Copies of this chain bind each other. A is one copy, B any other.
C-alpha cells in the first residue's frame, strides 16, 4: 500500500521508519489527471516491492513539504535513500519509474 502522508510530523516519522530502504515519494494533486491514472499502478508496485517504501504527498494539503522540495510538476517522484535525494522523475511515466527504482534501490 502507498502511505498517504498527513503532514510534516507524519512524513518525518515515515522517513525514519524506512531505515535504509529506498523511499519513493509521489508528490501529486487531485487536479492532476495522470496522477490519478498512475495511482493504481503505484499501489500494485508497492505490493510487489516489499523492500521499497512508497509514500504519497498531496501537495494541496502539504504545501510546506511541496515547497521545501521545490516541486513544480505533477506528479513528481522523489527517490530517497539514507536521507539523500538520489533522483527525481517529473511526469506519470510508470516504465521510467520502474527503471529508476532499479537504478537506485
Contacts and interface: CB of A to CB of B under 8 A. Distances in A.
Interface residues of A, number: 19
A40 to B, nearest CB: 18
A20 B23 CA distance: 50
A8 to B, nearest CB: 13
In terms of DSSP, what is the predominant structure of the interface of chain A?
Answer: loop
Residue among A29, A64, A91 facing the most chain B CB atoms (10 A cut-off): A29
Contacts of A72: 32, 34, 73-74, 91
A97 to B, nearest CB: 16
A73 to B, nearest CB: 4
A59 interface: yes
Residue among A33, A60, A72, A74 facing the most chain B CB atoms (10 A cut-off): A72
A63 interface: yes
B33 A63 contact: no
28 contacts: A29-B59, A29-B60, A29-B63, A30-B63, A31-B59, A31-B60, A31-B63, A31-B64, A31-B66, A31-B67, A31-B71, A32-B66, A32-B67, A32-B71, A32-B72, A33-B67, A33-B70, A34-B72, A60-B60, A60-B63, A71-B74, A72-B73, A72-B74, A72-B91, A73-B73, A73-B74, A73-B90, A74-B74
